[PDB]
From Swiss-Prot, chain C:
Functional description taken from the UniProt entry: Transcriptional repressor of the nikABCDE operon. Is active in the presence of excessive concentrations of intracellular nickel.
Family statement: Belongs to the transcriptional regulatory CopG/NikR family.
Species classification: Bacteria, Pseudomonadati, Pseudomonadota, Gammaproteobacteria, Enterobacterales
Subunit structure comment from the entry: Homotetramer.
Protein name, per record: Nickel-responsive regulator
Gene: nikR
Annotated positions binding Ni(2+): H22, H24, C30
Curated annotation (Swiss-Prot), chain D:
Native source species: Escherichia coli (strain K12)
Cofactor note: Binds 1 nickel ion per subunit.
Magnesium listed as a keyword: no
Keyword RNA-binding: no
Name the UniProt record assigns to this protein: Nickel-responsive regulator
Keyword tags: DNA-binding, Metal-binding, Nickel, Repressor, Transcription, Transcription regulation
Length: 68, 83, 66, 82
């Protein structure tokens, strides 16, 4: 029931409630780094993280949990 | 030479709408320092891009993206290079 | 009246908070962008004061009522 | 040395501000891309610094920040250029 830092990478051109804000940064010509701050139920968190990360094309996925 | 803040709101859920803005963002990547996204409701998502470079090419990526579609509540705050 | 707000301003790095972003725009200056959420009365108030503080420069505010 | 980006995240209750700031900047800096600040409660601030530069310097800077007394949950996620 706390916060979390979900970070992952994906190609920019290749065409909720847990979200607080997300930072986007182009680490190079094709990729962009995305750092999502999540707040809520660690259960709901850890899963939404898994999903995206588990996603195809979603490289460097990392979740840092900070329970309340 | 300079820094700028381009903010604007648009329905996050709009593939077409985003796909444009993106490749429009991707056209002049070298301008972007970092961007922040915040869901302001169920459909609309606030977007704040921090830019750096020629205030010229800046306003260009700006107005371009600004006058993209649906892209509402657009606003640009240029920060001149003479403190 | 609820709503989101974008507060931005400059300064020498020397309750309504959503997330705040900091960026050095030179060895001395720092650009700060604060995303606020809540009662627009308070938001603009909080915003108005910060912008008025000596040392705070180029303060701007874009309100997003809803 | 290897080049890249990195995500330095850490929590602290916002002198130890100036302490961190003395780290952020004076000893190493120009490595910072941008930093996100989020209040996880009345006392604690969650900070996320996106850094870019030589991976070595990035790690030393990160060593100096985490080391700090009072900084908790410090994590460094390196992204050397792929």
């Amino acid at each position: 029931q706390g916060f979390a830092v979900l970070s992952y990478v994906y190609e920019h051109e290749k065409r909720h409630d847990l979200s607080v804000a997300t930072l986007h940064v182009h680490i190079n010509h094709d990729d962009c780094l995305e750092i999502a701050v999540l707040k809520g139920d660690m259960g709901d968190v850890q899963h939404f993280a898994d999903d995206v990360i588990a996603q195809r094309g979603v490289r460097h996925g990392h979740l840092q949990c900070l329970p309340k």
